[PDB]
Amino acid sequence: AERLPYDASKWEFPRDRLKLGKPLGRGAFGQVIEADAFGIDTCRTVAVKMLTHSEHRALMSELKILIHIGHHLNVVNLLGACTKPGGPLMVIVEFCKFGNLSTYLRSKRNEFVPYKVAPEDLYKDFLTLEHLICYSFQVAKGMEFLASRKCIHRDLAARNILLSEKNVVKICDFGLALPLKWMAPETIFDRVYTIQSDVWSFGVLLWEIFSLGASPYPGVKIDEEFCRRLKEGTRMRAPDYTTPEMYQTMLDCWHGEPSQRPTFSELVEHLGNLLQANAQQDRHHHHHH
Numbered sequence: 039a040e041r042l043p044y045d046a047s048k049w050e051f052p053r054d055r056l057k058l059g060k061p062l063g064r065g066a067f068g069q070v071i072e073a074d075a076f077g078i079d080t081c082r083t084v085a086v087k088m089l090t091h092s093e094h095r096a097l098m099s100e101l102k103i104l105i106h107i108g109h110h111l112n113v114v115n116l117l118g119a120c121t122k123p124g125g126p127l128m129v130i131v132e133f134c135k136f137g138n139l140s141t142y143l144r145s146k147r148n149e150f151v152p153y154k155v156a157p158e159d160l161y162k163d164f165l166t167l168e169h170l171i172c173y174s175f176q177v178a179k180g181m182e183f184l185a186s187r188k189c190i191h192r193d194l195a196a197r198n199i200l201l202s203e204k205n206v207v208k209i210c211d212f213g214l215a216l217p218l219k220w221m222a223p224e225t226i227f228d229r230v231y232t233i234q235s236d237v238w239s240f241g242v243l244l245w246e247i248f249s250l251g252a253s254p255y256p257g258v259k260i261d262e263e264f265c266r267r268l269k270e271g272t273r274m275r276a277p278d279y280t281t282p283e284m285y286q287t288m289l290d291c292w293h294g295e296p297s298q299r300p301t302f303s304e305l306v307e308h309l310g311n312l313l314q315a316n317a318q319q320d321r322h323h324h325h326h327h
């Protein structure tokens with residue numbers, strides 16, 4: 039991280055061109071605030087992370103990595119940073135107006151239909167299978183992108199996915215780069231973090247999307263036993279809005295042996311086909327009715 043460089047000439051942004059706003063989050067390090075940036079791109083709304091020695095290098099490493107990784111439609115885009123003397127360290131990214139996916143889906147539980155048929159009006163701004171499968175496809179693409187760069191997210195979960203304009207989802211992170219319900223067995227017991235751990239987490243996110251924002255492991259005390267059972271083979275039951283192939287994808291992601299889990303590249307191709315098959319069917323449903 040400290041080895042990666044920082045082209046200040048390309049990213050540095052003036053602190054007095056930012057009008058801080060309302061808090062979008064809080065942690066033990068500092069916070070993420072919404073704000074107006076003038077001329078970062080005119081005035082645009084953005085999200086700012088700001089601040090201990092250990093935490094400062096962590097925020098700088100996040101900045102350092104986002105620059106190294108580059109741009110991908112499904113990963114929060116970096117717009118700039120305030121690193122030169124005069125004020126606190128701030129990392130600036132695109133503002134995702136609609137919030138975290140979990141909270142969004144919980145809100146659309148009464149606005150869901152598997153697919154639409156005329157009069158398509160009864161379903162104005164409704165969620166469908168096409169939507170749910172698409173959010174999964176996109177998160178998988180962003181993870182393929184991150185995994186290709188040897189990047190381990192470590193906290194993949196619905197609360198860390200944000201909904202943008204025109205159903206575009208973006209992988210993000212409110213913290214500074216225990217959440218047991220998203221942690222793989224080897225991460226809980228061996229404290230190891232791998233791309234394969236992230237694949238497990240992707241499965242839980244999957245469950246969250248097709249349960250429409252429900253919390254994982256419904257009605258279960260997260261304790262020693264919970265963990266012992268995860269290690270012994272116990273898995274969540276299919277969520278209310280899942281399709282058979284999707285639940286089986288969840289199960290492949292939850293494989294006990296990390297090596298036997300699909301890679302994000304396989305998940306992209308697989309999810310991609312399901313979305314294609316769903317599209318096919320919706321066409322026929324729309325046509326017959």
Ligand SMILES: O=C(Nc1ccc(Oc2ccccc2)cc1)c1cccnc1NCc1ccncc1
Pocket residue numbers: 062070085086087100103104107113114129130131132133134135184189190191192200209210211212215
């Ligand atoms: O998400 C942010 N940062 C981030 C993004 C991607 C990462 O991916 C990543 C890259 C390499 C390895 C591991 C993880 C790690 C860290 C971030 C940075 C600055 C300000 N806010 C936010 N998020 C909240 C937010 C964003 C938009 N609207 C509302 C709230």
